[PDB]
């Protein structure tokens, strides 16, 4: 059928981005794979006294523009090719919001749901130990991702600080505020999505007051996003978690759903009448925002989507063949490398505050974040409509342009 | 141990009120690192003296450690340990990304030449360099040290490093990376704490009645600054006597006829006593440098809505116990005097960037830090219904305790 | 006519009128460190050519040294030594936390290839790396060097460092941490100097007639923006206000200092913000030299030498060097 | 009463030794206290999930001759004065056997007998992290001491190597052989004491075969020394541990006791009929070897010692007043700073082998060790005979000599 491989799909779009920007084959050969990939084995002493050895990855795509940036995720399904692909997305993310960053990513093949606080801390410290030679505040700056949070950032920051013999808060982002974290971090991604949703609505003459929104997924990003749209006067008509979906044409009570909400963001289990995820994606609405897993809009349902605007809050919600379909149909698609750039942008701000040793207040971070998301959306949208190309390809051109120019300037090509 | 064990109890009392267990106190009751050092120095005559130096680094959970270096014959290990722990609370009060540091050398600077003080300054840096630096432990001035001693220490560290490291030490001259707006940083800090306490009690500053004890460089500055803002200062005092006159007192004229020691009351025949100065009819009262002026014996006699401690423990804990039960707004010294630590922090941020702020921008950033610090302590004292001194202790220690928990130290 | 000795006479006079001892001159009359290096470069024809390069560091009393690197067949050791001293004076006029440096390579870049220029630049960075860096000595562009040579040098230092070091060198392209507003930095710098000279003479700019003598590059921009030993003392008798080269050209050193500050933070300013700080710096610098020229009753050429060397002499006294 | 403080006791002998060598009062002011003393607090997660905070020390006496050298002990009675005097021991030890080292020492206030394997590992790692800024293969080289061993050395070596991001075997000595340790290091202390006993026996004309030897202590030094002496044909009539002592005029069965020894060197609890340590020290014998704790021979028992040769294997087992008494009674005393130099000597060999990445075998290490201990006994003995002073003072003069010369050369002291 169609290509669901995340790594080769990203390469195919990056090849076309570099082609439309005028680069020859050498530039693609330099960017189609990360410059560095470190596979690592971490022995960890478990609570029962036994020893478990975990496989970890740290990928570094390109440090042409600056140090690399990207979070570390703990999941049993972490794979090498997924880490490589996600690090390229980080290059594209940073290029879109014009950060002095290259792309990086990390991952550990493990199940934290089956581990204790003491075991996760020792795995977290053993991860920094195993990769410390190629990371640092000026080399490679991790952050939170799937199943990692501020508490794990705190251990990784402490472990790196111990080996360095001084405090290095710039090594890692997403930290607790007391350890040099940044205000506005928890809501960074949902804020950027909210900004980009507002701009897409302007470009299609949709008023947020009364706008019908459905959001797939009720995690950290999906729930924060549901509360922002509710506060802006929009009707969040569709909401889902991993187990099911509920829907009301006049607007659900987001405050009711957020109160009795699971620690994993599960609420549909408390209801008798649910409507599942396959149907929620095909609901009638103005704005459809997937914020769950990947490959939810996949050609088979791409023609059945009733939204006029689709904003990728999660990673890889719609396949390549689906973006093609959604484009012919006239839907305004906002790619994930642009829509979810708010997380990278505030992480960047945290790293800058660590560099200076001087920290910004809530209003300053939000003002800086808004100008970034606003200018980035205009650049991607202008490129797409001007060149008559889809928004994902247009976003990859905006995102990869700086790394290619830097690679050529530095003599790498 | 007198000051040190007292400081240990301050930490235990604040941690107990915040809700931490015994292990948190066992981590913070003693500095994580204490370096005792012996420094050989060639004296002018050709002989060699060996001095005892100290560097205490209380906790670097929040960030690099920060605190001054004093040259004094009475420096002791327990004193530098206690004082570094106070730097932790100070930095926590103004929410600085700092931990508590402190250093000291046992010597008599008045009996030493300028070259001997320099060579002693360089040997001290050389002896503790392994554990200090712009990202580890940032020293500064204190008793008997000045910008020149800071300049000598900045130079020796940059020599060892093979590159200029102005962020290693604060209090440097302006041509070596020092900060503008530093001279009256502590005194102007107390000014911001007085005005903010006035607004908490909804007191008009224009007609406000102010009483100030002591008339040295510290108190006389506050007297002018208050009258300059239009506040009506009704009482001053010095080492010998005190003067009380209602509806103002023309501070500009008192500064005119002031002695080089700060003695102004030997030029008046009918002068009121210093004990009467403490119980006047004023909105705002600010004690003097000496300690124990407000005690349980005269605590109920205070007739002021606001009291700002501006000098290391002028009121006893029982006087604080009584003043706070009477509903009086007391301001501790650790909160009011945090302006100097704040501006020393700014010098470091400017040294981290290589970019330096104008004087007015320094003063604008100093106001917000003092403003937000006052609101934080007042909010904590109010919410928990405790005196503002204990609340200042809790705000000062909270960040270090939370950071130690996050990093797995406990 | 020797540039090095003539520069030494400049510094000796400024220090005496500022009131320093002759031991301060002996410390400042020569750079604290001068590195002469020989660079093997593999040429296109397969042969090897060994070039001579210099790196002068005048004084790091105020901070890290700053100064561009020139590629020219006439580069000489006395030229780069004196040029580093002029960088100390320039940085002191705009009150930058810098000392003076300068580099040069005896080569003819017009007779060299694009690959040979890259391998010569890399060999230059390799050869002097031990005494340069973002905290020691920060090079930049000069006579026949530009943003591409800066990029090759930035890349080489970063490779040896094993991490990106944008702050090592200025004049870089934007995508590598370069600064906005560097394009017309010196040109806008001369524009500032002219306007503040009109307010001191109480002259309205709108009704002011303008005469320009440049036939090269900046004068054309200068016209659009508007729309010696014995000669300097002649203009002082007539009451004319002369602005020296070391002051009106400091806009180049000012924006490359901004680029370095942004590389220190990893945070970068937009063009209008750079113009804002660039205006204030040339504002104060002209005022500082104007105060010195009038308060001390001397010509402006010597006034600028006193402002530029003051901060270095004071820093050297504080650190215990003299 | 008598001065039982180990730190101030050493200072006076160091002052008197530097005086006889003709140094100025400034040299004593430079060497009377360590140049560097780091006091440290180490948090450790215990097995029950709680957190204990321990106190650590690392004294660096003088690094004028080279990097500072000395072990780390784990004992609930360790004090700041103790590790200071211990570091000063090490300076004089290295000078006596002419090692390119200065003196250093460390200790942690804890009770290993009450801690698990995991808790000792986390404490050992916590101790390296706490002092890592001032230690290293070129700065300060730790090693084994009381209640520490090759396993704790291995944990501390691993912790330092991870912080440096590469293997640093030269950071710490007493390592297992697989981690770059040296052959002969395990028994180095007892072997150096053995060589010293043979040299003292010659000058007293006492044959080792048949000599009556008693040893206080049954730890690493006491255990090996008991077997070293019984193999050489000596009657080990006296043995003791932290709880009692055993006596047998025919010579105790050392192999029997070694087979039944605790992890901490305890064996006398298995016996009904034991004597105390005070009676152990006053037994009639030829050679008395204190290898237990400090201040065992004091003014109250110095007159009651019946051995003709006293060899101090432990650190500071006899007091200053007891030294004077023992000397005036014609007893041949071999000071701790000389007799116990075998451990630091073979540790030094281990460090050289770490420097080169090339390792020696037992016979090579054993040949180098004997030359050092033999030459060092002769130098200290000749000094005491030529200058007519007690052996401890002579040993301090020999051991303090190189540090004072280096301090002068490096410009640290006047003239």
UniProtKB/TrEMBL annotation, chain A:
Swiss-Prot/TrEMBL GO biological process terms: L-glutamate catabolic process
SMART domains from the UniProt entry: ELFV_dehydrog
Active-site residues from the entry: 105
Binding site for NAD(+) 5: 218, 220-221, 242, 265, 292, 315
Gene3D superfamilies: Leucine Dehydrogenase, chain A, domain 1 (3.40.50.10860), NAD(P)-binding Rossmann-like Domain (3.40.50.720)
Domain Glutamate/phenylalanine/leucine/valine/L-tryptophan dehydrogenase C-terminal positions: 182-411
Residues annotated as binding NAD(+) 3: 219-222, 242, 265, 315
Site entry (Important for catalysis), positions: 145
UniProt-listed InterPro entries: Aminoacid_DH-like_N_sf, Glu/Leu/Phe/Val/Trp_DH, Glu/Leu/Phe/Val/Trp_DH_C, Glu/Leu/Phe/Val/Trp_DH_dimer, Glu/Leu/Phe/Val_DH_AS, Glu_DH, NAD(P)-bd_dom_sf, NAD_bind_Glu_DH
MF-aspect GO terms: glutamate dehydrogenase (NAD+) activity; nucleotide binding
Residue positions binding NAD(+) 4: 218, 220-221, 242, 263, 265, 277
Residues binding NAD(+) 1, per UniProt: 73, 144-145, 218, 220-221, 241-242, 265, 292, 315
Protein's name in the database: Glutamate dehydrogenase
Species of the source: Lysinibacillus composti
